[PDB]
Enzyme design. Sequence first.
Site, short mmCIF file in Angstrom:
data_model
loop_
_atom_site.label_atom_id
_atom_site.label_comp_id
_atom_site.label_asym_id
_atom_site.label_seq_id
_atom_site.Cartn_x
_atom_site.Cartn_y
_atom_site.Cartn_z
N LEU A 12 -3.69 1.53 4.70
CA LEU A 12 -3.74 1.29 3.27
C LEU A 12 -2.35 1.22 2.63
O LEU A 12 -1.37 1.80 3.10
CB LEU A 12 -4.59 2.35 2.56
N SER A 13 -2.29 0.51 1.51
CA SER A 13 -1.15 0.61 0.67
C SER A 13 -0.89 2.06 0.27
O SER A 13 -1.80 2.78 -0.11
CB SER A 13 -1.28 -0.28 -0.55
N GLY A 14 0.37 2.51 0.41
CA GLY A 14 0.72 3.89 0.10
C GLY A 14 0.47 4.91 1.19
O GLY A 14 0.73 6.11 0.97
N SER A 85 -2.26 -5.06 7.52
CA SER A 85 -3.09 -5.57 8.62
C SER A 85 -4.57 -5.15 8.48
O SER A 85 -5.04 -4.36 9.30
CB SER A 85 -2.57 -5.03 9.95
N1 ANP Z 1 4.07 12.46 5.79
C1 ANP Z 1 4.29 12.35 4.46
N2 ANP Z 1 4.53 13.43 3.66
C2 ANP Z 1 4.77 13.31 2.33
N3 ANP Z 1 4.76 12.12 1.71
C3 ANP Z 1 4.53 10.96 2.40
C4 ANP Z 1 4.29 11.00 3.86
N4 ANP Z 1 4.07 9.73 4.29
C5 ANP Z 1 4.20 8.93 3.19
N5 ANP Z 1 4.46 9.67 2.08
C6 ANP Z 1 4.64 9.14 0.74
O1 ANP Z 1 3.80 7.99 0.49
C7 ANP Z 1 4.50 7.09 -0.27
C8 ANP Z 1 4.10 5.65 0.11
O2 ANP Z 1 4.83 5.36 1.25
P1 ANP Z 1 5.23 3.86 1.81
O3 ANP Z 1 5.97 4.07 3.10
O4 ANP Z 1 5.87 2.98 0.79
O5 ANP Z 1 3.73 3.39 2.07
P2 ANP Z 1 3.28 1.91 2.73
O6 ANP Z 1 2.12 2.22 3.69
O7 ANP Z 1 4.48 1.21 3.29
N6 ANP Z 1 2.77 1.18 1.38
P3 ANP Z 1 2.55 -0.48 1.09
O8 ANP Z 1 3.94 -1.05 1.22
O9 ANP Z 1 2.08 -0.56 -0.33
O10 ANP Z 1 1.58 -1.17 2.15
C9 ANP Z 1 5.97 7.33 0.01
O11 ANP Z 1 6.66 7.29 -1.24
C10 ANP Z 1 6.04 8.67 0.66
O12 ANP Z 1 6.79 9.53 -0.19
N1 ADX Z 2 -3.64 -7.63 -3.42
C1 ADX Z 2 -2.90 -6.83 -2.62
N2 ADX Z 2 -3.39 -6.17 -1.55
C2 ADX Z 2 -2.63 -5.39 -0.80
N3 ADX Z 2 -1.30 -5.17 -1.00
C3 ADX Z 2 -0.72 -5.81 -2.02
C4 ADX Z 2 -1.49 -6.67 -2.88
N4 ADX Z 2 -0.67 -7.15 -3.85
C5 ADX Z 2 0.51 -6.63 -3.62
N5 ADX Z 2 0.51 -5.82 -2.50
C6 ADX Z 2 1.67 -5.15 -1.95
O1 ADX Z 2 1.99 -6.07 -0.85
C7 ADX Z 2 2.28 -5.32 0.35
C8 ADX Z 2 1.21 -5.59 1.43
O2 ADX Z 2 1.65 -6.75 2.09
P1 ADX Z 2 1.33 -6.85 3.65
O3 ADX Z 2 1.60 -5.57 4.34
O4 ADX Z 2 2.04 -8.08 4.11
O5 ADX Z 2 -0.26 -7.23 3.60
S1 ADX Z 2 -1.17 -7.86 4.71
O6 ADX Z 2 -2.53 -7.64 4.23
O7 ADX Z 2 -0.85 -9.31 4.73
O8 ADX Z 2 -0.88 -7.17 5.94
C9 ADX Z 2 2.26 -3.86 0.05
O9 ADX Z 2 3.65 -3.44 -0.01
C10 ADX Z 2 1.56 -3.82 -1.25
O10 ADX Z 2 2.19 -2.75 -1.99
#
Ligand code: ANP
Ligand code: ADX
EC number: 2.7.7.4
Length: 173
Positions: A12-14, A85
């Site tokens: 998931l995102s985040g 993914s």
């Molecule tokens: N093990 C952990 N402990 C504490 N905080 C965490 C941990 N893992 C992730 N986080 C927090 O979760 C937040 C989101 O992390 P990020 O690495 O940007 O997520 P992501 O999966 O790459 N998101 P997205 O880019 O939207 O698909 C970060 O700001 C971290 O501070």
């Molecule tokens: N509609 C959306 N769904 C998911 N992520 C989004 C969307 N719009 C913006 N984002 C942002 O775009 C990034 C996700 O892009 P990818 O990892 O490249 O996605 S994927 O689905 O094609 O694998 C995350 O950093 C997320 O924060």
Amino acid sequence: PPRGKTVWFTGLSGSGKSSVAMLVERKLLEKGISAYVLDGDNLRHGLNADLGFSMADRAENLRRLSHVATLLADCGHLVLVPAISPLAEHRALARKVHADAGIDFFEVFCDTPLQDCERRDPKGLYAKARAGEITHFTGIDSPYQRPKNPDLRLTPDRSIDEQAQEVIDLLES
Ligand SMILES: Nc1ncnc2c1ncn2[C@@H]1O[C@H](COP(=O)(O)OP(=O)(O)NP(=O)(O)O)[C@@H](O)[C@H]1O
Ligand SMILES: Nc1ncnc2c1ncn2[C@@H]1O[C@H](COP(=O)(O)OS(=O)(=O)O)[C@@H](O)[C@H]1O
Ligand SMILES: [Mg+2]
């Protein structure tokens, strides 16, 4: 130079994909191991700037990333790919591209519950999605299919630094 490998991070995102990937890259580099991060978000500003978040565009995004990963692995790099993914077929496709290129492929599931990702909400996207300001957002109104058998499942039970060390342990095992 020996051929590298790919660590593919889904979730998931985040969920922490990019954070863990970047810390692994740093830890490896410091030890004289060539690593590089191909981050879905960053590449969506260049190579993948023509793509959106339709399922077809996500498939294309991830197809491209899988070929770029095999090429950097063929060069000797340890490649880290933090990308949502969301579909099983997306990970299967990446795995296939790697099999076809003879590059080892590890799948890492950043298994952080939606509630926690939302409770984090670092770019404000969950709040936007729930207000209807963004549509087709993974986990809210676009699907996420959970990996059935990842090589490693990271959970929010330890620091990012420790999660990065678990990825390294996986590679070094
Ligand atoms: N093990 C952990 N402990 C504490 N905080 C965490 C941990 N893992 C992730 N986080 C927090 O979760 C937040 C989101 O992390 P990020 O690495 O940007 O997520 P992501 O999966 O790459 N998101 P997205 O880019 O939207 O698909 C970060 O700001 C971290 O501070
Ligand atoms: N509609 C959306 N769904 C998911 N992520 C989004 C969307 N719009 C913006 N984002 C942002 O775009 C990034 C996700 O892009 P990818 O990892 O490249 O996605 S994927 O689905 O094609 O694998 C995350 O950093 C997320 O924060
Ligand atoms: Mg990210």
